[PDB]
Amino acid sequence: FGVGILQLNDFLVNCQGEHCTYDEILSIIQKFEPNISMCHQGLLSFEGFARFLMDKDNFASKNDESRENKKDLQLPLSYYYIESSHNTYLTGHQLKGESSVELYSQVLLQGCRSIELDCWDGDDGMPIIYHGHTLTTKIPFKEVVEAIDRSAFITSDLPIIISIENHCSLPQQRKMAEIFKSVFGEKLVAKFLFETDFSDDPMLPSPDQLRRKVLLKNKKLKAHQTPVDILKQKAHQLASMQESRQIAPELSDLVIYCQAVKFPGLRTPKCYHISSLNENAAKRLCRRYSQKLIQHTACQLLRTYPAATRIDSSNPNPLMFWLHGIQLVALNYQTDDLPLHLNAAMFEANGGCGYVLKPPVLWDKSCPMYQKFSPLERDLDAMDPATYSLTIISGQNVCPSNSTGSPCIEVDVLGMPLDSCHFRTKPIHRNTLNPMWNEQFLFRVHFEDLVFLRFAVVENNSSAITAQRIIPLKALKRGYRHLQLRNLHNEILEISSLFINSRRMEDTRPASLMFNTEERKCSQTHKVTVHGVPGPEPFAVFTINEGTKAKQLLQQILAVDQDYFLMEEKHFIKQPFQRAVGPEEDIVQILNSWFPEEGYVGRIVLKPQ
Ligand SMILES: [Ca+2]
């Protein structure tokens, strides 16, 4: 009549990758089996098992439940992607359209940490913001700085970087400096703050150390060698009479950690230098100097922005840049397009605070692939990729206000080129309300740390995109799950969703270990279920890490005083497969060898020798 606890556990471990205790499972039955006499015998009915997984609170994303990690925020500023806005003051087109002050408030409230002022002369000796030599409307500089002060730290107390595109006179550059000091007060970094900044080989300080701080990014006056050089240069200026090159000292003195420099290629220490490349120059840099660009971004910040050619405020794909460890990929937040949605999926991580620690191959020396990795290269023959299966089972209300459209689902794997690939289902004829596809895609991935899954709903007739969702691959939960879809403005569509299965396998050496560190392994929590543990319940749960090994798990189980080994068991739908586990073998590697929906469920068992 129904599913037992032992059998509901095998399904949850193997398909859903959730290790629940005897009691948490008795709870799921109590919550989904209405019939009390079933409930009293520990049996979930078949219609109740279906209700359990069809439930609206069976979401796909782990990022629903992600929050700031204090430790992950304790490394140098340059080890992080940093959510960034291009020409924040613009509402639409780059050469026409309005400037708005509020846009700084909206962007910063969202969790953005880098924003851009383009400062020009106002006819009354007060700096104004607008796109130079165009029909953009002008907004007051002061109003913008106040908007940033109010809203900078409402959503996230992690430091912002103000990108100043300085086109003012020296008189109005001094105004700018008064207003930065009077408005931001003790939040504005106006001096080197840390013991670590006066050390032999200095690094940028941690985004943690800089909570509730505002970093200016402007040009900084180069230090003159002697009194005479200053006076001689001054006599040169006088002698010939009959962005802006000059920099008010008042403003230069407020530039500390982010000293803008025309890009030098590949006397203030270099970790305080930062450069701003149009997308074309940054792409050239990524093709030509792949590994050098990665060694550069380990110690210094680099900022890319949209090409000048994109006058419609289109956006470039951020992946190229993030894979070379570029931190500030500055997008037009006013343009809903696939890249802005890629941006948003990236900065769901770490509580949406706007600082995400980089995949450790682009900074941690103890990563097997440190300095060997170029993301544009196909010859990864050293390593065995992880095998992903993704079933698109079905949808609900996938094209709002079009009951009679014919939808298919585009699924795009977006990562380094080698990991990239496109799928598309058959179109369901005239049913956007509860279409069923039950179509499966296989794909392999080497660099899990920066793949994005894009689900788009495409109305086959008009070929228009009606709903969309992007989710980091590592964020997708294994098993049967509901994927909340969103409209083309990345707003939640309260009823529209897809029902999906995903599976992951690991069969030279595995990629996820080649791209890992022993420090990240031992800090990644994983749960294991073990049957046959002396005790009341027939299976117990244990907290471990991706680094824990058979010998270590054995000590953890047994240490409490009353010749045992762990057994890898596969039970079929026969006689069970049984493999003794080697004392020095990684446990999580065994759980990731299993593949569900192949006629077995995996267990780990304690046995007497
Ligand atoms: Ca600009």
Numbering used by the authors: 1303 to 1544, 1638 to 1661, 1729 to 1969, 1975 to 2029, 2037 to 2047, 2056 to 2091
Study authors write:
The phospholipase C (PLC) superfamily hydrolyzes phosphatidylinositol (PI) lipids to produce second messengers that increase intracellular Ca2+ and activate protein kinase C (PKC). The enzyme has also emerged as an important regulator of cardiovascular function because it is required for maximum cardiac contractility, and changes in its expression or activation result in cardiac hypertrophy and heart failure. As an integrator of signals from diverse signal transduction pathways, it contains regulatory elements distinct from those of other PLC enzymes, including a unique X–Y linker, a N-terminal CDC25 domain, and C-terminal RA1 and RA2 domains.
There are four copies of PLCε EF3-RA1 in the asymmetric unit arranged as two nearly identical dimers, although there is no evidence of dimerization by size exclusion chromatography or small-angle X-ray scattering. The PLC common core domains, which span the F3α helix of EF3 through the C2 domain, have a similar arrangement as observed in the PLCβ, PLCδ, and PLCγ subfamilies. The highly conserved active site residues within the PLCε TIM barrel are similarly configured to those of other PLC subfamilies, and weak electron density is observed for the catalytic Ca2+ in each of the four chains. In the EF3-RA1 structure, the C2 and RA1 domains are connected by a 16 residue linker (residues 1973–1990). Although residues 1969–1974 are disordered, the rest of the linker forms two short helices that interact with the TIM barrel and C2 domain, burying ∼800 Å2 of surface area. The RA1 domain (residues 1991–2093) interacts primarily with EF3/4 through a surface that includes the F3α-E4α loop, and also contacts the C2 domain. Superimposing the RA2 domain in the H-Ras–RA2 structure (PDB ID 2C5L18) with the RA1 domain in the EF3-RA1 structure shows that the predicted G protein binding surface is occluded by EF3/4.
